[PDB]
Amino acid sequence: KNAAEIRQQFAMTAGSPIIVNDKLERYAEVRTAFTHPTSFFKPNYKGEVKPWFLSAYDEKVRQIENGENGPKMKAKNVGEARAGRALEAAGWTLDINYGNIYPNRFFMLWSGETMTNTQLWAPVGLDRRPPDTTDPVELTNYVKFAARMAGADLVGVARLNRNWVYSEAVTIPADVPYEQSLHKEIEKPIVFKDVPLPIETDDELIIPNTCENVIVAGIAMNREMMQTAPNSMACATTAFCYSRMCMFDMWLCQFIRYMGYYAIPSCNGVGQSVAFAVEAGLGQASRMGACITPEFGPNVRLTKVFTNMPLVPDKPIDFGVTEFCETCKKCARECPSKAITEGPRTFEGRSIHNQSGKLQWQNDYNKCLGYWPESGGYCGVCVAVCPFTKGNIWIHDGVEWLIDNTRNITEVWDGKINTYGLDADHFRDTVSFRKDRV
Amino acid sequence: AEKEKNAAEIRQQFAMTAGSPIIVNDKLERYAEVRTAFTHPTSFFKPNYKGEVKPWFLSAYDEKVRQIENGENGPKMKAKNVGEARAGRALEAAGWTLDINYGNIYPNRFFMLWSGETMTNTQLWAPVGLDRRPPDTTDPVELTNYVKFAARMAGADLVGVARLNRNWVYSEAVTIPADVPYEQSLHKEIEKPIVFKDVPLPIETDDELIIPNTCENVIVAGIAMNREMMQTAPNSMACATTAFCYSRMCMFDMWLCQFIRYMGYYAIPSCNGVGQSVAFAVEAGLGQASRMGACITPEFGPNVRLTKVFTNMPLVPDKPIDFGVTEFCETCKKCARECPSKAITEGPRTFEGRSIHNQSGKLQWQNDYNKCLGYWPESGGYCGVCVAVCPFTKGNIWIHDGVEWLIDNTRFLDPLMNITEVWDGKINTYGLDADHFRDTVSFRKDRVK
Ligand code: SF4
Ligand code: SF4
Ligand code: SF4
Ligand code: SF4
Secondary structure (H helix, E strand, O other): OOHHHHHHHOEOOOOOOOOEOOOOOOOOHHHOOOOOHHHHEEEOOOOOEEEHHHHHHHHHHHHHHOOEEEOOEEOOOHHHHHHHHHHHHHHHHHOOOOOOOOOOOOOOOOOOOOOHHHHHHHHHOOOOOOOOOOOHHHHHHHHHHHHHHOOOOEEEEEEOOHHHEOOEEEEOOOOOOHHHHHHOOEEEEEEEEOOOOOEEOOOOEEEEOOOOEEEEEEEEOOHHHHOOOOOHHHHHHHHHHHHHHHHHHHHHHHHHHHOOOOEEOOOOOOEOHHHHHHHOOOOEEOOOOOEEEOOOEOOEEEEEEEEOOOOOOOOOEOOOHHHHHHHHOHHHHHOOOOOOOOOOOEOOOOOOOOOOOEOEOOOOHHHHHHHHHHHOOOOOHHHHHOHHHOOOOEEEOOOOEEEOOOOOHHHHHOOOEOHHHOOOOOHHHHOEOHHHHO | OOOOOOHHHHHHHOEOOOOOOOOEOOOOOOOOHHHOOOOOHHHHEEEOOOOOEEEHHHHHHHHHHHHHHOOEEEOOEEOOOHHHHHHHHHHHHHHOOOOOOOOOOOOOOOOOOOOOOOOHHHHHHHHHOOOOOOOOOOOHHHHHHHHHHHHHHOOOOEEEEEEOOHHHEOOEEEEOOOOOOHHHHHHOOEEEEEEEEOOOOOEEOOOOEEEEOOOOEEEEEEEEOOHHHHOOOOOHHHHHHHHHHHHHHHHHHHHHHHHHHHOOOOEEOOOOOOEOHHHHHHHOOOOEEOOOOOEEEOOOEOOEEEEEEEEOOOOOOOOOEOOOHHHHHHHHOHHHHHOOOOOOOOOOOEOOOOOOOOOOOEOEOOOOHHHHHHHHHHHOOOOOHHHHHOHHHOOOOEEEOOOOEEEOHHHHOOOOOOHHHHHOOOEOHHHOOOOOHHHHOEOHHHHOO
């Protein structure tokens, strides 16, 4: 089992793998099921219509009171039910409003100037000193090393494709306090202009034309916990990884700034992570819609940082995911809301929530979100059942690597765990030396 | 055949019976935090390389800047080029992103809030009421398993529980007034007593930081640093693994406190504040005190950072461990010989503090920590040479003789009988090492008995 060998073997020639037509336009973030007016409101189990996450809260409370870890899933006792939800809620500590999407707010600042760390370090002047390194080869090695220090299990670099950057972001006015944020979300254009630094005006989020590159990180979720989907421990590994995303973005942006460049964090905001991840060679797009990686399958979170730092783009990877998803359809059969299509890929979105103009499996994401208040979590059954999520799907026939075609919650709490939920049985797969960084 | 290393076995073999291992006598009094070398007026000021007397960290900054300009990664250590020198300091600086003023010591300020109520996460989750609902679990056995599982999720490589020994809680904390903005914080530090009272929840008044008498337990976490980077001490990459682990500590405290709160209990974070981490770690069984003064663990030696959380959550205390560190430190003295400031004693343990920076009244090796801090502006970093040269920091110390585990004495022979390569070499997530990561795997049996 050698991940470096595997990635080398399945490396493509250069060029975005995403097939597009002339109808493709940048996508307004408000259109996602989380935020759009058509999908935002959902009934709770009492028949009261609320913001989807508030109705999901009502189900978490009902489950705790009834000693359940998920829908129709009895916990060992009320204590266990409570612990799962306590772990879930805690995981989100370093995340704003489920995904950190508002750009240049809270943790996602587009400049480091006001950060306590930057202020403390100001006399050294690292963020003001011109770069001492402009060589993209050395920079790629440096920033990838920093990325691993910052908590990425996978890291890749692509040229920034503006097609995947949201046309308009969901955000809040800059002087609105957190307690009012959910009630004062607004739309705001993201535009590219000839300016020296990322800047936000009253009217626009402005990314410089010099913002050449995107650095994409994979943040691995815990297999045992995700396999409890749609129950509470799947929610907990999801949540902890969002806080890991946030710390990754801040750490890496600060490193890049202290190297003499600018850096834009994003977590779930600014653009479509799956498209960037595919273009940066982390994995391939799949039927369920996720980026499937050789190391973790789809059981990995994504975040990304945009920068003018000169870098060497990674090659896209083709290890046969498209052909496997063609015949598999297991996520689609197991999906509790029938959100995932069993049909062929097309360029035409199923609803407002899809971006038309790119060849993909088109899924109904309102159907997906509808299951979240019903189950009181973030589901994840598709991730859990995907063959690529299983530990070792990789075999070697003596010449090369190939996919092996052949492929409760109390026990999780009482079972194997390790730091950040990583697994020492597999952790060697993400070891890195210079040769695999650049 | 070679027996595969079993860290759980090793800890079981060397487990002690219950009781604080730290030997004390009647001169022992709680220690005022302002006495540490970082904060005390006698030690706080250090000359820079031009002889200008400044706050120690400002003089160290001057040296970092000088090194970058001169293409160096440390004192008299030439870098590959200026770009490499720059990169090491950029990585170091970035590492500190989630840490306030080198340690997060001010209690109930910034990240170290003693209540979760104002946190954005708590506000978002308020409708579920997890922080208001009485505990559904009071069994200390189940709580210990739950909270240790949460601790591993929250980034701890080691976790242990002890009853809170107030002897190691600072008598007065270093902090700032609540109305003082971050940019003035380093100018406006004050002392505030930490007191124990019959109150329901941790609370701060104008005059006191008040910990409830019900605050029974301390949870101690070990946060592993990176071996390859620390072995570059006193140069910049050792500074970088130090820095990143401080931000990991902060994340750990906030994550774990929120879990404990959402379980229906209260929780006090601390990072480098509130009390003496080495003493708590020893009492919680993470490892043993050592000549250099650090807690030496079987897994990482001293090359591991510590943080701690205080709580009324019922828990099962862990047993202390004795794997012979004291007897090795008695005869080894490598850290003392290699220390660039001669801060570490080569003499025996005593109950008498060397200077104001030591807490008298506990049996320990007494080191001169003003001498230690003095080397930091000189070298432009946080040194760490003692951690780097300690044989317990090597990954290779444990052997099995067919009957039991033991320490390989050959690793202590004296004499034994670069930074570019680190940047170009092995790394993995959070700087953890997959060659050793199995050592911190955990099942219920090793979380609670
Ligand atoms: S379950 Fe099957 S069809 Fe769905 S994403 Fe995984 S491999 Fe593709
Ligand atoms: S998360 Fe659940 S409901 Fe949503 S697509 Fe996956 S399986 Fe279906
Ligand atoms: S170097 Fe030797 S004396 Fe110093 S702490 Fe390590 S084992 Fe003890
Ligand atoms: S950090 Fe350096 S100066 Fe301080 S005690 Fe250790 S070796 Fe000596």
